[PDB]
Design a protein around this ligand. Structure first.
Ligand SMILES: Cc1ccc(Sc2cc(C(=O)N3Cc4ccccc4C3)ccc2O)cc1C
Length: 208
């Protein structure tokens, strides 16, 4: 059973701006998603210090980048704390509202789209390169969920019956047809070294 939700108006406006504005420096999406993975990994590691059983769902803390040219997907997998249903359908949108308004106002003051992560809404930079984003996520003591959106003001959430993840988040970027450079080994490596050089978890770039 699939539930369909409306983005809050401010977040829909942000996604439209990301999709419609001319902006050539699209590669920043990868830094923003890796940063989110790193923050999620930080949090499970921190919480496991007072409750070690939180690592029963998996002790390894890492980030994997997986291109698939046949499916035209770039997938980013981490074993961080994951997201609850409440995060997905209600609570993260509430935090995104204030960040979006601030980011909007910064853009009119002369800020650049690459600063999106300073306003806590860097995830939506995925829409610089993806026509559809599918997010599989598993938080301890909650179900595995699949979040999905092709923008247009709505997203879906369902309980996911695919391959169990144990714990963490998997962001599946269905790339636009003119954005397949982000499937190339040399290009991904270039971007990670330039923008994500000091991330404190092993990042593995899969090849095909
Ligand atoms: C709603 C939403 C928000 C971010 C993303 S992208 C995204 C989210 C996560 C995740 O599970 N997090 C992020 C974070 C930072 C701090 C603390 C805890 C947690 C949990 C990890 C990697 C990502 O690339 C996707 C969606 C669907």
């Amino acid at each position: 059973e699939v539930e369909t939700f409306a983005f809050q108006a401010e977040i829909a406006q942000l996604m439209s701006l990301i999709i419609n504005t001319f902006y050539s420096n699209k590669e920043i999406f990868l830094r923003e998603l890796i940063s989110n993975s790193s923050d999620a990994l930080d949090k499970i590691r921190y919480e496991s210090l007072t409750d070690p059983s939180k690592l029963d769902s998996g002790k390894e803390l890492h980030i994997n980048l997986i291109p698939n040219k046949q499916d035209r997907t770039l997938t980013i997998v981490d074993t961080g704390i994951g997201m609850t249903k409440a995060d997905l359908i209600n609570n993260l949108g509430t935090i995104a509202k204030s960040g979006t308004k601030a980011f909007m106002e910064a853009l009119q003051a002369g800020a650049d789209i690459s600063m999106i992560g300073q306003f806590g809404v860097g995830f939506y930079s995925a829409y610089l390169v993806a026509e559809k984003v599918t997010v599989i996520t598993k938080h301890n003591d909650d179900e595995q969920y699949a979040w999905e959106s092709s923008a247009g003001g709505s997203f879906t959430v369902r309980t996911d019956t695919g391959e169990p993840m144990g714990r963490g988040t998997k962001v599946i970027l269905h790339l636009k047809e003119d954005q397949t450079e982000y499937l190339e080994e040399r290009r991904i490596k270039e971007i990670v070294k330039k923008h994500s050089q000091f991330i404190g978890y092993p990042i593995t770039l899969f090849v095909e």
